[PDB]
Amino acid sequence: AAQTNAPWGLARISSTSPGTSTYYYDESAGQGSCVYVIDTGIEASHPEFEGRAQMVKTYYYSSRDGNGHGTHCAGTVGSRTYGVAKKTQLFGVKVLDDNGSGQYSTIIAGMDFVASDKNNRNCPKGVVASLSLGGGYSSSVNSAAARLQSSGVMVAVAAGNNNADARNYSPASEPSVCTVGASDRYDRRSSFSNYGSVLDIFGPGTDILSTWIGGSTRSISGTSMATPHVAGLAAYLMTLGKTTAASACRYIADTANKGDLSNIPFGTVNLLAYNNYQA
């Protein structure tokens, strides 16, 4: 399939070179998989989700996304125009309040919720969790992300926006999950993106157009935007049968565009997520 005039990040993950505008992907489009978006929620009513989005859990007085962050990320995972895996099922777990904040103890419960709740869903092609969140280092948060991964879910987590080494941040510093840095449309490391050896992969993170609350759309930047690209790629690849929850981060790394990013610090991987699709 081909999506003409796709957002630059979508075109990027299906191309060898920057600066193209079409997104090439297999029409299975992640059908049969499930991506849990652990964030501020998802405006499931957005026409862009086609009713493939649904909230499954909140830790606050409402499950609505009063912020837009979560909706934007869910947009990049699986929305019809802005998404990597256009036929995936999206589950919203609201661990962040409408200011984008949440206690670590709430984030952990959310992860443990997903590890159990996937046994309540039909995901014959496997399960992904996208975690566009983080703060300072916490072994308990890392441990929770490790449990979520161990339970059979492909966990993608943002590297952080401090332009520092992600080892001082969680869950980004957890080895067994997929930690996602951010790059821009010119294959440059995004100015804010954390780095370090714990990074597994880079994704489009600068000027990412996605869904917003109120049935709108907008462009924002962050590793929070890179993460859902890789989460959606994972779901796409598992539907294709090419990898599994446990092996997807390694597979994406194996098959990534290598050596193409500028301003990658010594000791940080130079790998850009890539679907390797051939029409």
Curated annotation (Swiss-Prot):
What are the positions of the active site?
39 (charge relay system), 69 (charge relay system), 224 (charge relay system)
Q: Which family does it belong to?
A: Belongs to the peptidase S8 family.
Q: According to the UniProt record, what class of enzyme is this?
A: hydrolase
Q: Which gene encodes it?
A: PROK
Q: Which residues of the sequence carry a binding annotation for Ca(2+) 1?
A: 175, 177, 200
Q: How is the cofactor bound?
A: Binds 2 calcium ions per subunit.
**Stated name of the protein:** Proteinase K
Quick one: which residues bind Ca(2+) 2? Answer: 16, 260
Please name every pair of cysteines joined by a disulfide bond in this record: 34-123, 178-249
Please describe what this protein does: Hydrolyzes keratin at aromatic and hydrophobic residues.
Query: What are the residue boundaries of the Peptidase S8 domain, all occurrences included?
Result: 7-279
User: What range of the parent protein does this fragment cover?
Assistant: 106 to 384 of 384
Q: Please list the GO terms describing molecular function.
A: metal ion binding; serine-type endopeptidase activity
Superkingdom as given in the UniProt entry: Eukaryota
